[PDB]
């Protein structure tokens, strides 16, 4: 144990030196907190990521089924990146974006740079030139599956989309580190993600767990995200949070959830309480209270971060 722990520490250190910080971790380790991150819209997810948000200057993959919530997560990352004075770009090969929905999340759609490229290589090259400018804080690529090669589009073997991603990511990854720009690749449950799987510092699996009921009508979806890969903090953590149709991720809902999880928000049956005062009876009222009283929601948020060091 005594003489062994040194050789283990030494081995860990050599690995960390040889291959980079985060090359090996104990899963119970505390996360090493960076200066700045891009918050995701849910404190539960921010906590699951360990560093309180998405890492700067790294490749991120968000994948999941159709309408799983992965784009919503990406849009919140854009909103927050902009809300802190950043510039955003959206590389769009799907043509599915809903700007009004993005607006209600917090995206500044007017100053959002958008490109609807002709080919997969044009898409990645545009992303690259944008990244090497040093002016972007975040770029979203929607989506991996849509990055079809020129040759295929021009009617011309089958397999070079993988080769395209690989080539592009090798060049792009260096540009991202230097610029400090975060690149989010949205991906479905596909082709091209094999290289992305290794280049990405963070990989998030996004799924819908159950329908949220508004009496007997569908208000939204409880959403589950597993951080399957994480080079910035111990991986395999997961979070749940609500996405409300038309509104997005319920920030107030995650503050409550993580509130009670951390003992900062106590219970009296249906009654949610905070520092001796009542927030509301049931989650809806407690949530509705926090959007009405932004001051206390921010206090609840600040207390959760202090508690966990996020």
From Swiss-Prot:
Pfam families: Intein_splicing, LAGLIDADG_3, RecA, RecA_C
Compartments (UniProt record): Cytoplasm
Family annotation (SMART domains): AAA, HintC, HintN
CDD domains per record: Hint, RecA
UniProt PTM: This protein undergoes a protein self splicing that involves a post-translational excision of the intervening region (intein) followed by peptide ligation.
PROSITE patterns cross-referenced by the UniProt entry: INTEIN_C_TER, INTEIN_ENDONUCLEASE, INTEIN_N_TER, RECA_1, RECA_2, RECA_3
Described purpose of this protein according to its UniProt entry: Can catalyze the hydrolysis of ATP in the presence of single-stranded DNA, the ATP-dependent uptake of single-stranded DNA by duplex DNA, and the ATP-dependent hybridization of homologous single-stranded DNAs. It interacts with LexA causing its activation and leading to its autocatalytic cleavage. PI-MtuI is an endonuclease.
Family classification: Belongs to the RecA family.
Name assigned to this protein: Protein RecA
UniProt gene name: recA
């Amino acid at each position: 144990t005594p003489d062994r722990e040194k050789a283990l520490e030494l081995a860990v250190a050599q690995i960390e030196k040889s291959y980079g910080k985060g090359s090996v971790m104990r899963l119970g380790d505390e996360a090493r907190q960076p200066i700045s991150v891009i918050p995701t819209g849910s404190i539960a997810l921010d906590v699951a990521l360990g560093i309180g948000g998405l890492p700067r200057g790294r490749v991120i993959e968000i994948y999941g089924p159709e309408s799983s919530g992965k784009t919503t997560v990406a849009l919140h990352a854009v909103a927050n990146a902009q809300a802190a004075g950043g510039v955003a770009a959206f590389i769009d090969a799907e043509h599915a974006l809903d700007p009004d929905y993005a607006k209600k999340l917090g995206v500044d759609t007017d100053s959002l740079l958008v490109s609807q490229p002709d080919t997969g290589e044009q898409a990645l090259e545009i992303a690259d030139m944008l990244i090497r400018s040093g002016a972007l804080d975040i770029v979203v690529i929607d989506s991996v599956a849509a990055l079809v090669p020129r040759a295929e589009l021009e009617g011309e073997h089958v397999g070079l989309q993988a080769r395209l991603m690989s080539q592009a990511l090798r060049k792009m990854t260096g540009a991202l580190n230097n610029s400090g720009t975060t690149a989010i690749f949205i991906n479905q449950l596909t082709t091209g993600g094999k290289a992305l799987k290794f280049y990405a510092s963070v990989r998030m699996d996004v799924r819908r767990v159950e329908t949220l009921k508004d009496g007997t009508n569908a208000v939204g979806n409880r959403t589950r995200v597993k951080v399957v890969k994480n080079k910035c903090s111990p991986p395999f953590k997961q979070a749940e949070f609500d996405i409300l149709y038309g509104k997005g991720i319920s920030r107030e809902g995650s503050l409550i959830d993580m509130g009670v999880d951390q003992g900062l928000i106590r219970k009296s049956g249906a009654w949610f309480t905070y520092e001796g005062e009542q927030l509301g009876q049931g989650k809806e009222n407690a949530r509705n209270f926090l959007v009405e009283n932004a001051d206390v929601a921010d206090e609840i948020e600040k207390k959760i971060k202090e508690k966990l060091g996020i």
